[PDB]
Ligand binder design. Structure first.
Ligand SMILES: COc1cc(-c2nc(C)nc3[nH]cc(C#N)c23)c(Cl)cc1Cl
Length: 222
């Protein structure tokens, strides 16, 4: 009897300082947790800047999709908030290198800044704004697709490790999805009014379309 599907999953340890940062963030009380969304939208914008730049000299970079935009997708039934972009995306090595195993100077520097009295909202200036996701999320899943490459899924609940595997669910043309599985007391970020006010307040200068898709699984059809 054959399995419908089978795939290899790799588990990697976070570099020490990244593990420390994630513990501080996911565990500590902060009054301004809404900044996570700003940080994630900012990273999407950067990724969109990148594919756009590459396409300037090689238009075929956009064969996997010309539209450059950001989508925000609250799903109250799954208790997830997903941010999707059609940016450059990442290779498997990119995921492993850039989301856990190699620490930049900004990781330690940021924690030093916080100890010296800085605010968590500054996190983006240290290049680690992604991890601010764990202010509101207990688990984060990153689905990503780069040109000429397969679709991969990265995931961590911040236990000091993350997994990587091939994603065969729903094929993306190109880009990245960051799926936040929200903490039970952070479900306000699934509400339309909350998402809208946070984007209005913090992402006014993002130069790409940002579009809300309110997701609901229709009855008897989950
Ligand atoms: C600079 O540091 C990071 C960047 C990205 C990232 N990279 C690319 C190519 N696209 C993205 N879209 C949304 C993202 C987010 N968040 C994102 C991630 Cl997932 C983690 C880190 Cl630590």
């Amino acid at each position: 009897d054959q399995p419908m599907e089978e795939e290899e999953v790799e588990t990697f340890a976070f570099q020490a300082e990244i593990a420390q940062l994630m513990s501080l963030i996911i565990n500590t009380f902060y009054s301004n947790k809404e900044i996570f969304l700003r940080e994630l939208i900012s990273n999407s914008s950067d990724a969109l800047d990148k594919i756009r730049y590459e396409s300037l000299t090689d238009p075929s970079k956009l064969d996997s999709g010309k539209e450059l935009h950001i989508n925000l997708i609250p799903n109250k039934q799954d208790r997830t908030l997903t941010i999707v972009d059609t940016g450059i995306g990442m290779t498997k090595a990119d995921l492993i290198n850039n989301l856990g195993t190699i620490a930049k100077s900004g990781t330690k520097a940021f924690m030093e800044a916080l100890q010296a009295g800085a605010d968590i909202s500054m996190i983006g200036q240290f290049g680690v704004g992604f991890y601010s996701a764990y202010l509101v999320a207990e688990k984060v899943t990153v689905i990503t697709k780069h040109n000429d490459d397969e679709q991969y899924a990265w995931e961590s609940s911040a236990g000091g490790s993350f997994t990587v595997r091939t994603d065969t669910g729903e094929p993306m043309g190109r880009g990245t999805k960051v799926i936040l599985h929200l903490k039970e007391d952070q479900t306000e970020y699934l509400e339309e009014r909350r998402i809208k006010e946070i984007v209005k307040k913090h992402s006014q200068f993002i130069g790409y379309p940002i579009t809300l898709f309110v997701e609901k699984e229709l009855e008897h059809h989950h």
